[PDB]
Amino acid sequence: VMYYGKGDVFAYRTYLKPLTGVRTIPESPFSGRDHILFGVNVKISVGGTKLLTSFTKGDNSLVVATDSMKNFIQKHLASYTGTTIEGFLEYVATSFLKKYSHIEKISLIGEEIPFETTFAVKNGNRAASELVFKKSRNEYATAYLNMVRNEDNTLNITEQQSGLAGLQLIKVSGNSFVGFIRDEYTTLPEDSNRPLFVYLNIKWKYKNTEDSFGTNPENYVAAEQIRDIATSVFHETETLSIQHLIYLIGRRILERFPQLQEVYFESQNHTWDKIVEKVYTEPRPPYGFQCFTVTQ
Amino acid sequence: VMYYGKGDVFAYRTYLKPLTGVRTIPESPFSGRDHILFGVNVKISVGGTKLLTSFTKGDNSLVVATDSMKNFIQKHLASYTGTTIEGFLEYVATSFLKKYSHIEKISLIGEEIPFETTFAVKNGNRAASELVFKKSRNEYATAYLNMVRNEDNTLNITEQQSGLAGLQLIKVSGNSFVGFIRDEYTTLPEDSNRPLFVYLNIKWKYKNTEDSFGTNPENYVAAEQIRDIATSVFHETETLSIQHLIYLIGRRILERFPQLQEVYFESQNHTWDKIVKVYTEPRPPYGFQCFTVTQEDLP
Amino acid sequence: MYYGKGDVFAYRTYLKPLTGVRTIPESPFSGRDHILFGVNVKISVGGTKLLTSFTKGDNSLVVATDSMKNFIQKHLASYTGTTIEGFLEYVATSFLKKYSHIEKISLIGEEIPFETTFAVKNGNRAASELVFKKSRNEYATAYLNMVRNEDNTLNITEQQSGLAGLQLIKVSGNSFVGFIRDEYTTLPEDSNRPLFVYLNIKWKYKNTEDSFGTNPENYVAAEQIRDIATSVFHETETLSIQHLIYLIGRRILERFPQLQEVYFESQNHTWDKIVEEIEGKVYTEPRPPYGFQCFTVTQEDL
Amino acid sequence: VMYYGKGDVFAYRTYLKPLTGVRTIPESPFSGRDHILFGVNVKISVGGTKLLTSFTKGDNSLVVATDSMKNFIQKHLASYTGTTIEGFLEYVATSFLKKYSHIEKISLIGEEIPFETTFAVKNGNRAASELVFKKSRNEYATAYLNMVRNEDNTLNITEQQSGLAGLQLIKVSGNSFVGFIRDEYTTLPEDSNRPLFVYLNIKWKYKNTEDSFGTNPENYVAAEQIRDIATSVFHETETLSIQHLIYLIGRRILERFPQLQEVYFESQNHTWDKIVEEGKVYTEPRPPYGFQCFTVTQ
Ligand SMILES: O=c1[nH]c(=O)c2nn[nH]c2[nH]1
Ligand SMILES: O=c1[nH]c(=O)c2nn[nH]c2[nH]1
Ligand SMILES: O=c1[nH]c(=O)c2nn[nH]c2[nH]1
Ligand SMILES: O=c1[nH]c(=O)c2nn[nH]c2[nH]1
Ligand SMILES: [K+]
Ligand SMILES: [K+]
Hints:
It is classed as oxidoreductase. The structure is a homotetramer. The first copy, chain A, has 296 residues and is an alpha+beta fold. Chain A has one domain: Urate Oxidase (Roll). Helices cover 21% and strands 38% of the residues of chain A. In chain A, a hairpin with a 4-residue loop joins β10 (273-274) and β11.
């Protein structure tokens, strides 16, 4: 009930250590990240009982300026020798608590800024550019970390989660929504073949926090692989609801990644309307949503 | 966990029962709401153990369609005879749990869609129009309500909060930020006179949930009044930090409204840079603060 | 062939106040305190001598766009006038005088509006001179283009003022009937709809000097235009947005004979009645498609 | 000075006729569009002297409701038998002017709603799905058409343009910006190696309007191909300014597509700042953004 910090701390770096040696799965071609260009948007929040008088009295003696937190994060991207956004948050968190002993808790959110490769031609041969990248406004990897300083001054991870945000998938056929309650408030017709359009935010938790850092990359779960599981499962099965779809996606994730403990879904329904006069159009604003956890 | 529902359920109606008989405070001229035009954006979430098979098996037998929740909310705005957004959420929640016995929990968020009065001339007389309103994209009232059906089938409120969101205040002078840690990570200069620009989201919790509904309107705490306390407190004193500003705003709120238990702040710093005096927009990173003031903080 | 800088924000305190304005029945507007002033400027420049900056990569005659930003921001500090229109003229004249190889400059200025707030001082509640609320609602605009002619004289080549971002809903007293009903028509006749319009209004002065504030009795304030729009919308049963904006434009030109013409860009965002059968009507947000209208009213319409 | 219409007319259709047989170029693998899923956002504007009294008098007798324009567009996506967004706009325009004789002008803008393929597994083999697509918020194709009814009742295309919007490209090295004017207003340091970040909107006009419709797909210029030219040209050379980059992109486009008359660019500069406080680290700049407008002809 007393925290402060900095949001929208963007930091971009070239030639981060490549992520290599990740275990591949049948649903995904993902085998690593070259890391020629790496971007992250970090939010940092900190607290501690010794900050009380910064609120109650206007005493700034123990206030790390939020501007300085921004400098801390950006400088640490330059010195980070690891390979994942999760490991970067861990580096920032441990470093920050080691620097500022009066801080008792730090919470970090990191959002990948995704870039995609582009094509260039050199002497007749077209290939991926190592220089020119396309900024993507589509799905992106996320990471969350909370760390605390205990009364015996050890540091402990109290929460850690990885994710995939902003995935927007439409399946043109092979989706039903039937059998729901029909009463005085029901106008929705039964539909045995709708073009289901779902937004997915998927988060996962590791059994062992160390697996999230890429130290042993064979145990890392890449957001890219989660994406490709999601599209494969959506494709493979006649859907009966978004609820049951996210259940089946979660089951496949836990099957493919036994090192995970849980998968959490936040989904939204944005399915198009058939037009007034198959052609579809955008619906009115109200959107359905679902929240669901699958456990290993 | 397992929940599902509908967001962005907009509903507009004219001639909601007016809010009057409120209790005034020195910081605010607020005296009620005409309610000629009323709008709300509702989010509804529901849960219950009996919904498991809708996820695990694709059995929709016990699923209230989210489209039907949308219909339920919109129709109930037509039949609501009360005077506040908080009371509207209570009416929706109680009505919904009574209709659907297999639902164990409902969670509602309501955001006011604010409209402002405009001028019209009628027969040489300029006055506020009863017909034409301006849609506002500035601050707005909010309300939060969670309700449960207990195992013994009684219904109980499990969370209730009211709020003010989207308030953006700049104070051109009379703000200092000095005395903070200056170390190897510090490039921020001391500034004894900055144009502090804060975004405020303020939420309050009543001691007695009935006071939020408007039934006895003298016990209601209006978002307009909270707004006016925030602006007066910001004006009245030299600020030393956003942290300490929100503490003083919270203390004044709890002093003016003894029926409140606590008040929660989420603030953001958006202060302008001096240009490379004239000011300009900063880079994207923004400071923020989260703080709860309780009755234990009172004089 | 043009280049420039957008989103050049500049804020200052205690700009010279705007006073001495001429009033109209529809509006209480009496001036602007200018305790807090903000503007968002876009600048675009051109000139034949800039060709090789494109064709060859030669930057020798390029004013960096960063330097344009510095120019604008510094000139808000030295501006001694009272309107956004005048500020643009000051920037444009100053810029072309500084950079003789630039043949054309185009400026857009958007007001960043702030609203007064209440404070209690010693038991007296009054408007604060210190704390303001940033507004995301309607705002004044200004457009100015200037050229350096072949003979080195400077001339304004376009000037318009405006009001943007006005969103008005009239809950009753609106009809839309009599339109074409054919095989593409699913819209019912509606003799009483809650018409919701977005308005962007621009006006052109007969005499460009009247826009600058030098003789402030000839200035047309966006606040006054706003208040004409709300009054006219209230006063009469609307028959369409088309005819509403015609009537607003006629009133503007009648109230401000120093204006040559007024231009409207309107959009229809009227709510739908809710799907559920219903006590009074309830409305909700429509699907995304929006109607729009563009219309110019001139003195020939009076 | 008198128009009205409808914006944000979204229409989505499955199994539009595929676009096949497009001439390839070295910079791009593009050969066509499966059109399993097709989406467009249309804006329609119409005008005509016979609409005057709808404004001056409130007489709606000759008003096609904007709602009905929306119906017209959406129904015509169902009946369109062609293969390009440009051809769809031509179909809508000709059909609309043929239906409503009192309309003298129609202007259409179409924005592709882009969808990307996704992976699915069958029998352990991973391949692109024919059912599941990913909605993209990145670059997209555009088309513009203005058509008028002449006094002799012939219909005439008065403006026609195709485009690519929303392309955001960053080149990490191999970019300079030096030699610009340094005077009392200049604080920007010269930079011989910046990570240039450009937004590109690219439009092109055909020599012969018929080439935009896909009827002979060998003459069609796909926005995908323009995208890939842009990234190749950006890669290939040390840039000296955005101005000179868009010039070189335009020259390459006109070389690869001799059926084009002109290329028009609207570019923006969003290059990151080096941080205040090992390799370099960058961050987001303040809001002011540079921009350029430029036309290449031939
Ligand atoms: O997948 C769905 N789940 C739902 O709960 C629902 N409600 N309306 N449509 C729906 N679709
Ligand atoms: O009010 C402020 N509080 C802070 O914590 C801070 N940090 N930088 N600037 C600041 N301003
Ligand atoms: O005011 C309106 N003008 C129009 O042209 C129109 N078309 N549909 N609804 C409409 N309303
Ligand atoms: O490429 C650029 N062109 C410009 O005109 C400019 N001005 N500042 N930086 C710039 N970069
Ligand atoms: K009072
Ligand atoms: K008056």
